[PDB]
Enzyme design. Sequence first.
Site, PDB file in Angstrom:
ATOM      1  N   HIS A 197      -7.536   6.305  -4.511  1.00 16.37           N
ATOM      2  CA  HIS A 197      -6.081   6.208  -4.447  1.00 16.37           C
ATOM      3  C   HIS A 197      -5.578   4.773  -4.557  1.00 16.37           C
ATOM      4  CE1 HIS A 197      -6.026   4.666  -0.334  1.00 16.37           C
ATOM      5  NE2 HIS A 197      -6.739   5.694   0.090  1.00 16.37           N
ATOM      6  N   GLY A 244      -3.867  -1.356   5.254  1.00 14.59           N
ATOM      7  CA  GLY A 244      -4.801  -2.240   4.588  1.00 14.59           C
ATOM      8  C   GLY A 244      -6.259  -2.028   4.939  1.00 14.59           C
ATOM      9  N   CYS A 284      -8.010   0.804   4.390  1.00 12.93           N
ATOM     10  CA  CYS A 284      -8.698   1.743   3.509  1.00 12.93           C
ATOM     11  C   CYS A 284      -9.858   1.051   2.808  1.00 12.93           C
ATOM     12  CB  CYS A 284      -7.733   2.330   2.476  1.00 12.93           C
ATOM     13  SG  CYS A 284      -6.337   3.237   3.187  1.00 12.93           S
TER      14      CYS A 284
END
EC number: 3.4.19.12
Lengths: 301, 300
Positions: free
Chosen positions: B41, B143, B145
């Site tokens: 993503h 932030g 991920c």
Amino acid sequence: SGFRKMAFPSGKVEGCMVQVTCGTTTLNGLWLDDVVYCPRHVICTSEDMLNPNYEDLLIRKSNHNFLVQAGNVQLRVIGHSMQNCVLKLKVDTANPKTPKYKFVRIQPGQTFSVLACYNGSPSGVYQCAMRPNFTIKGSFLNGSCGSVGFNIDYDCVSFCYMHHMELPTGVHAGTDLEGNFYGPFVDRQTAQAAGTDTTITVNVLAWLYAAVINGDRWFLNRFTTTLNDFNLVAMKYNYEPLTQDHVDILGPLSAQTGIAVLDMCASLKELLQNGMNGRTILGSALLEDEFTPFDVVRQCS
Amino acid sequence: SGFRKMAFPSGKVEGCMVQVTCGTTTLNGLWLDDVVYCPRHVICTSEDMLNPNYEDLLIRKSNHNFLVQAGNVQLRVIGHSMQNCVLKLKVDTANPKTPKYKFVRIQPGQTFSVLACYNGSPSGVYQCAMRPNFTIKGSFLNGSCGSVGFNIDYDCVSFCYMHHMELPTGVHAGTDLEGNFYGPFVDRQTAQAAGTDTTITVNVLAWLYAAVINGDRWFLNRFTTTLNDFNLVAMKYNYEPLTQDHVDILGPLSAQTGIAVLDMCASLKELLQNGMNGRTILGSALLEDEFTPFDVVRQC
Ligand SMILES: C[C@H](O)c1ccn[nH]1
Ligand SMILES: C[C@H](O)c1ccn[nH]1
Ligand code: NA
């Protein structure tokens, strides 16, 4: 979101751990520049530990009596000396993985990360706080001595603890990296015991602010108190006195949540007097006191 | 003595964390050999997270659309492919700090360490468990991920989790390093909720054996139980069913303490019924379920 007991990344410290052997005793050492730091009781036999004369015991040792193993490589000891309860072994090789570092001494209530090691090889990392009685509630087995505690401020590792011994109540005692003990302890086999511990009040308040930031609000109320009124409650429940410096430090969390410190101490005052009544806070039925205000701000912002 | 929730030393994983940027989105990637792994993503825009067509978004991307930063150095992307829910960016340089490693998909109840990271720089390390509802109770901000979960065994790092998103209840969902999500979740921003979570029974029992090993016996009793009777009671407290596999896993801890598994099961039944009576076990006022049988033998 979420709140966890969080340790600093241990990589910069892992590259500094070595195995130190002198006779039968083998423990861990801290290799920085061309010096290996480790507890001075490595030179003591089982009988020496009952009443050691370290200056006389060390004056009879020589450089060849210290085997220092950095992973798969021997380090040749070219010098030895003592500073307080820490043994400094000058080696022939400077550690190429030496990080930017300082030796600092922490205050009771401050937190740090511990890298537990065995035979110079790190096995785990966990967070803990210097208790008001100068012990730490660690997790150590035989061979853990020489394990170090640290904080990281950007690029610089601040070494603040070296593990020396376990007390009969299962808690632990050690020194700073300059060999000065935390607490009224000595490095020998005598009858030693931890004093009665207290709860770190400023840390509990910080943890309550962490709960509010994470959506736990049921303990907030309409009331507020004064520093003198609350400190009477704190002394009765074996909490450390809250000072004006503590209120200043909690300032940012109070502004970020709209809950004044004395406003929040009113919540804590009611929690101490009445309990939690089946409810939990951040998944705990206990009041957590091993998060500093800085810990909360760093993890929650 | 003592019992702490201990994470693995994070050094071998720190040397693999990089920063991956696409468009205005920045997150973390895992740099192993000449491949960088990161959540797919990263290629989604504002208009995309509800019903993204990842194949259509990726086909419009070139290698130079992905910026990978390792410390201060730019890595040049020379290829990119999608495997399930993870992006795999091929880079011109092999990571010289690549440890011995493998990819493992774990089962609910297993524990692992998490290296929380932001902009490719590690922030902290903590221990977690895969819950029965395939979520984890972590600590993640915007932030994070691409942060990874792992175990280490004899200098081999087994990567088992990559962080993808936070659910509305504040718990976190992610994939294994092959891009397959744990649980029924998807990298979509539509309504999806974690199933009702339960307590990891086999872990509580192991943690009770750990308390005996450290010299605490106050919670034992003189009773035993059948396995089925124990499960009929425990499930009334939202505990996971205990299987014969779990009984076998606890064999070693039973032999070291001298307490048969079903006898410890009887003590757990009484603890659920009585509470702790103002006492604690290994320093906690609740029954802990994020220590596995393997973890207890390792620390004790
Ligand atoms: C258990 C072992 O004796 C030990 C030494 C220091 N801490 N623990
Ligand atoms: C809450 C925050 O946005 C976040 C992103 C991923 N995990 N948590
Ligand atoms: Na109030």
